[PDB]
Amino acid sequence: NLCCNENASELVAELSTLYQCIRFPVVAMGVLKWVDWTVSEPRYFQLQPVHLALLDEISTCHQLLHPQVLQLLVKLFETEHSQLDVMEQLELKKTLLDRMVHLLSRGYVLPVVSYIRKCLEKDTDISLIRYFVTEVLDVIAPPYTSDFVQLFLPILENDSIADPVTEFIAHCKS
Amino acid sequence: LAGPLTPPVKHFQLKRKPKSATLRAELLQKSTETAQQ
Where does this protein reside within or beyond the cell (chain A)? Predict the structure, then answer.
């Protein structure tokens, strides 16, 4: 009923019942497709984005929905609008990077850093990767398994600041 | 039928809470506001 009504602020009004009800898996998927189609509209970020918050309930509370959420945000991390300037595109990208770092904190670490490596090697400017490393090394606690280092540090070779980067590189090479 | 679930391996203990949960609390403030309505 909420979803076909074409909701934003009313979402925040009844967000209590929503996060109560996203615990149902099928409901989480239904909201995921709804927010996908609303947010996939061209230039939906110039007008309310609360929608990206809801993935935090989904991915955190449902492990097997980690692949979907990142595979949603891979499109949203490639958002480009002439109206919302490259500054606002980079703000949205950095917000999505914070979401993807949170999703990494839930254990979905191999494909996250693999795609980060790929789009750096492509699209994603060095500023976005530096902000990625900033948020990561601000949130992730040691020890860092080599399965994560093997992709995170050889792409971190480009930069050396966010100092936490020096500590991370020294710990993970030693 | 579809078999058991295996929880993911935790590679490290979280020294803090993610900022996502902080935003969940931030929006829970307005949730309590709607409860007051």
Answer: Nucleus
Q: Fill in the DSSP letter of residue A107.
A: T
The technique by which this structure was obtained is cryo-EM
Closest by alpha carbon to B31, among A51, A8, A16? A16
Segment (H or E) for A114: helix A110-121
Calculate Rg over the CA atoms of chain B. Answer: 17
Specify the amino acid at residue A31.
Answer: V
Q: Which residues of chain B does A56 touch, with a Cβ-Cβ cutoff of 8 Å?
A: 20-21, 23-24
Contact A117, A78 (CB under 8 A): no
A60-79 CB burial, b ≥16 within 10 A, e <16: bebeebbebbbebbeebbeb
Distance between CA B7 and CA A171 in Å, rounded?
28
Closest CA relative to residue A78, chosen from A58, A93, A63, A59: A93
Closest CA to B18 of A148, A98, A168: A98
Rounded CA-CA distance A122/A125 in Å is: 9
Question: Which residues on A lie below 8 Å from B24 (Cβ)?
Answer: 19, 53, 56-57
Work out how many CB contacts closer than 8 A connect A with B: 63
